[model samples]
Target chain A: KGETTDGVYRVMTRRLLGSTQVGVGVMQEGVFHTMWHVTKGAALRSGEGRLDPYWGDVKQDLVSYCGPWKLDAAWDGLSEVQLLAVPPGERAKNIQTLPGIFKTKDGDIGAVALDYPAGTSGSPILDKCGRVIGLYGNGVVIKNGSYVSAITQGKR
Target chain B: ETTDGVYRVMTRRLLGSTQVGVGVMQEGVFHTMWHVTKGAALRSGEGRLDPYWGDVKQDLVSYCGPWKLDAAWDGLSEVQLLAVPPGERAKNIQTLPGIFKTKDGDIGAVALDYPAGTSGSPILDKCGRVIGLYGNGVVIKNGSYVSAITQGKR
Candidate 1:
């Protein structure tokens, strides 16, 4: 095998580690209930994976069901769920589902279950009305899976 | 002029140029509930009376109720009806009920019933729940029962 490709990979790995940052994501039903942490390796192999390995790992830390996650009046009416993620800095960005929104006592919102490696941003889940739910926390791990575009940056 | 049978007498005392007012000393029946503050009377007239007396007056004043002027609560929830002095009348006293009626040393809360009419204090049921407050004030006549309701919260 030619070692040129291996050398380039090593250089890219060094650059990635240098800029490695913590992230979060969410998974929908049939797996994790809320949020998950994203890892650097998982971020690199995000859409490249076959079966989306992150789904199985995030199934473990399911916190609370039927939670009044985000406080939004419109979303509350619809019983929306919301997911939050603290990228590297600033407040946690609320990620939610597009089609479906949820309602809470505070208001209406949406949410998505985080599904990534132990440290990447997850999917944005919403309720039928498009309200915010809750975000994935720390304990999420995904393997081979197709990653979607980040809702914040708008890029996959 | 003294007559053997029932006699009509002019009980006024005329001292020189001054005419002193006087009335018969016969026992008469007065509706105790009717002697509320002017405000309370107006509230009662509005038909919006919250049934409970606390709706019109402070909690303390309504407790006096339609008893004789000297009827008081003597600490342990006991009501002690006493005789008033010759000169003291219901109008001359604080018509509204108060904590002092029960405990001699207790001072009543500041009056909240407004508009200056005959108002009573809040009345509490046996379970310690507020039933009503009675008072007389111009405000009550104007249909402002909020003062009683706010004081009832206390």
Candidate 2:
């Protein structure tokens, strides 16, 4: 379900397997907190994210609560999507409530420089007006350049 | 042995033979909580027979550099195991796909803040799923995180 299901069941998904492969979907609902669709080798390697049928571990919402919905995200070239998370500094104690800037219409993480070693994991992005636009879910390290980013929310 | 027990036993065998003080755990395949090269660092100097340093301990002391980890949870108790790659999992595993749900509720395992010196802690999702070991994470105006294990100098 990487793509929307004929626009009838557009399940939005994100990558999660240690930055390894493209995983499956999780409709942000009460139940589907930690879910996956990964390779069998990876599936068997770790039980925490494993999909076990016999062992009887529930996925909270294994199937997902997906359905056709707006789920609007920022698409403008310069729309603000600043990221927010705890970094080491004086404000370490201050946690912002979904701070800003996620992506551009092109699905690029525009603000990759402000944070160097700080923005490697799933840091949320926001816009200037403070809208949780997208997640900086993925990145790749370059030989002599800053890590490149993708929108990760998939083109819908 | 069950596949899980097989690798864990393998870890035990390997640990039983080595002099290095590395800690490996078996969640699925045997693995160490931290990532270090074959010869990155060790407990003490070379050829000292550093018995006091390498016998094995159940937990580590810290996570920034020397890497303090908990056998169960950074145990103060000592554990001596053969420290080596499980050599069981396939090589060159790519990014495994998964999701994150945080205890903060507003944020998930991928974005929660732990202040400082928290690299040793596991990044757990909403339902106790481990996302990653705590790294010095931060985001920017354009949305990117830093200090992933792969980003390390070594």
Candidate 3:
């Protein structure tokens, strides 16, 4: 497995289960994390844009197949939450560790000195040893070679 | 930090008088707040403003505008917003807009301490898209109001 191939994967969701919103996702400690707004108002790709009361009723296509990843757990919410349970498979063996930043309250994020292309949102921030520090998007701005976020929570 | 096409705008008027703000380059023009260049005297050797690309003050060689000073904001809420202060990195205040009445000349507001000269700073979205420009800030509760980019322009 390559550096990012095992840990990160392309994430896609349809608002109202209609138009597609693309982003990146990171899997760590058996939890999958990505931008919540990616599925902000998501529902199945059928009928009107009505939402399902239970996450299990929210099933739809995967947009495309990715390796051995399959929905393995019960699905639930979407408005303000992004939850997906894909069995990590043998590919999970090489996934890197999570950084301590995930445990801090401030979630004091750092900026990326390098320029990443568009659609790089939801990308994971990695340290020298490839430990995942934080997910890059979420409106965090990289100004003057430093990143700043005024958010108080850091659990994700 | 992510890099942007934002430049420093200087509105030079007669007698060496000048006003400064931030500008985001778009479609061969620099998008900035109207008030930043409102006093500009279109006449030669008078009210003229320009956008500078970098710290070396490299000329962007573009037209600054005739913006609608009376433009109104669309009132934003729950949107992920970004701000790139002049010569500073981007800062995203995580709080969402609450049910506060906007005063005259105010379109949107955020509760965070920003630098003095953040006016005209580019308000960006998570995709790094320029959505609005930072308007003037206030001393009350560290609130700063913003003018939507579409509202401030023709």
Candidate 4:
């Protein structure tokens, strides 16, 4: 289930932090979530953490309190759209696309391309059962295989 | 690219609750895969574990103390990746054991191909990023590939 608590997680997806990464934040939580490579987890927990080079595009500058965050509610209460939510590491069922989303190789890649691409930043990571298992984040492809993403974002 | 050659010990098996895999010598301490440390994007080694398991005494010395990475036995802001890999990939990267939730919401196992021990390991791809934590949880019931099983017990 989505956030039944208070305010929902809202973000404009201003396309900052480049294409490989997506930035999302639940203002209710007062912290913006972005690619972990830059943040480096709690290592950057200092009040002087940075979002990215193009944070200004999204109205987010050098964020101070950037760290892990919880999810809740939808963007606008717009529940008309639906998506296929496969658990990370789950075999790629078919070639499904969630709009800007892409499908790479998840699960059994050693056997076949059981994979999918997840949104880089936050929100819209709900499964078909409506359970918020995890959030989407930027995946660093330090390899040259296919530049394909094998997403499996789960709870922290 | 990544730390590859490290002697691993079996505190548990791939199906064990909290197991170990792909362990290596870091500075002096031996570190490998950990299910508890998986999925925590921005948590300190201690902060990540505080939420789930731990004896509550907080002593990583003698293996009787606890898992301590903060001090780094020094004051260096934890330079070592500790349980994590440096880049997603390198020439020889390794991983640890972890738990995963199944596709059926019935729980599952993380990913690892440890020849020494499948109990715990990190499942990384070509580029060498953590794809999954290797080890037990909800056992796969069918012919589903182990990789298709899960990613952390979350």
Candidate 5:
């Protein structure tokens, strides 16, 4: 299942101030996809993000643009919830995957019981079938388990 | 000297003091941070191999003149961030929880504190397999995001 997770990338966002933002991102259909908060106030017009391979030396730049709408702020910072897709180019070729499965709870949210590393804002949450069902939120509190933001619920 | 297979990478900085990095020997070749060997010859430096396979050292080469003796070494420029599934070692190495800083100004809230001279240290899994190299870390609100590992130019 190495390829199953091969598409995962260590996402680094350069900003005008503060430390560079570090998070996880996924690639699909020749595009670099990540969270809005990861690149908010990014230094460059194209979001100034760098993508490094999980196990190799291929590093690529990310070009992202925000969506027209955003999640409501009251939803525990989910207001930062939305998707930013970078323009497709050489970056997508390093680790590519098929469009994946998207699962949810009874409704819009989902949770994964596994323990994840800290600073995992945009790491993917996989289902029992290994489908990418959701993305772990930044500073998310783990109640019964770690809660995740349904990828399908985000504004594209 | 973490285990029989690991070695401490040592180098003298261009304008600073000596440095101690880490490396893992696969077969007969060594794998470690490029910056550890950057600006130097690849051949092993003047040091001795111990009976326990410990206390080994390498004197890396530098085009710059002799370093300012007494100045402390600041680590590498790049920092370790996140690791994907097959490469989760970047994220979850079992270090004790503590706070530290990287050369890049990122605050690291680590599960454990890494010593100042342990840059390029080996990040091993429970099985002792070398998965990544120790780099700088960043601490966010949720958990300690410690050291990152880098693969050589291959």
Candidate 6:
């Protein structure tokens, strides 16, 4: 049997200066579902002094002001492991934090967050039956502050 | 007799050998000579027939007794012809013929024998050249044997 998901997929790495992370999400019906994260820097380190600088500053600031971000669902092959997503129509400058585990080639597994650029597409996520689950999405953006406020009011 | 009535005359009668002589009339006197010397022509040496006397085929027959020259003289046979100078006849008796015709030009003045033991004596052309030789032990000249004579110097 040809198992599509069981076959190898490419994980693309981005060139960033500091510790970076990426997040992944799958689109179900029309709503976005968060799934995995891939992280770099202190999030991957075991020491207590190691801090996630990109997530502490840029990505946290965006999520606080922009509301819960939407995930982009286009199927480019990569596995997102950090919260980072490149903002649409802006230069890809920052990293995000998301949730996931890193399976190293040496069989040692570690926890990581999505640190990919906002527009970066990760490897294909596959179903248990080996069919493609969907593509990983970049971090979502709250385009309207009024919409964000309306959604908060509705939740209240 | 008076001096005005005196006369001088000379007469010579030449008898030539019919088998092997050549003749010529010079100054109203006939002279003839034997063209072949029997011992020089017939002696066998180096497996060839001495020219002007012996038959080449017959010499091969005598030397290679079990094999006949006709059947055995093939491309593979190592037969050769050699010329003996007239002065060397005592030592090198066997001589290849002095002239023969070949596929190319008549090999002029070569010492290779033509076939022998056949009907006609070798023909001489008008220039007194040996064109062909006798075959089957007979010489025919211009349809006659008048040229034939006995051997004697005259």
User: What share of the reference contacts survives in each candidate?
Assistant: 0.00, 0.00, 0.00, 0.04, 0.00, 0.00
TM-scores for all predictions: 0.19, 0.24, 0.30, 0.24, 0.26, 0.13
Give the per-residue lDDT of model 1 (tens digit) for A43-73: 2232242111221122222221111122222
Query: For residues A22-61, could you state the per-residue lDDT of candidate 3 as single tens digits?
Result: 5555644433444433332122222332221111000111
Interface RMSD against the true structure, candidate 1 = 32.5
Model 3 residue runs over 4 Å out of place are A1-156, B1-4, B10-19, B38-82, B90-94, B98-106, B137-150
Q: Which ten residues in a row have the lowest lDDT in candidate 2 chain A?
A: A52-61
**Can you tell me which runs of candidate 1 are displaced by over 4 Å?**
A1-81, A85-92, A95-128, A132-156, B1-123, B130-154
Tell me each candidate's RMSD, in Å, in order.
Answer: 29.2, 22.3, 19.8, 18.8, 19.5, 52.2
Error of 5 at A90 (Å): 37
Arrange candidates, best lDDT first: 3, 5, 4, 2, 1, 6
Q: Is the docking of candidate 4 incorrect, acceptable, medium or high quality?
A: incorrect
lDDT of 4 at B147: 34
Comparing candidate 5 with candidate 6, which one achieves the higher TM-score?
Answer: 5
Output the lDDT of residue A8, model 1: 6
Q: Candidate 2 on A1-156: residue-level lDDT in tens? A: 233222111112235433332222222322111121221111122224322111101111111122221223653555434544423221212122322234557443433333334422333344566443444434445576765544333212
Candidate 4 residue A149 C-alpha distance from true site, Å: 4.4
Worst 10 residues of 1 chain A by lDDT: A3-12
Tens-place lDDT digits, model 4, residues A1-156 = 223233223222323663332233322244443333323322222134323111111111112122233333331222222323232333212223332333446423101112334432433334344443233343334345432332223222
List model 1 lDDT by residue over B113-154, tens digit each: 332222332333334332333332233356543322112221
Instruction: Please give the distance, in angstroms, between residue A37's alpha carbon in candidate 1 and its true position after superposition.
Output: 25
lDDT of 6 by residue, B31-76 (tens): 2221232112221223332111112222110111111111111212
As a whole number from 0 to 100, the lDDT of residue A78 in candidate 1 is 39
Tell me the tens digit of each residue's lDDT in model 3 across B1-154: 1123665554444455343555555544455543454322222244333321110011111234222233332455344335555456766655453233445533455554455345566554445555455654344443544333323433
* Per-residue lDDT of A111 in model 4: 10
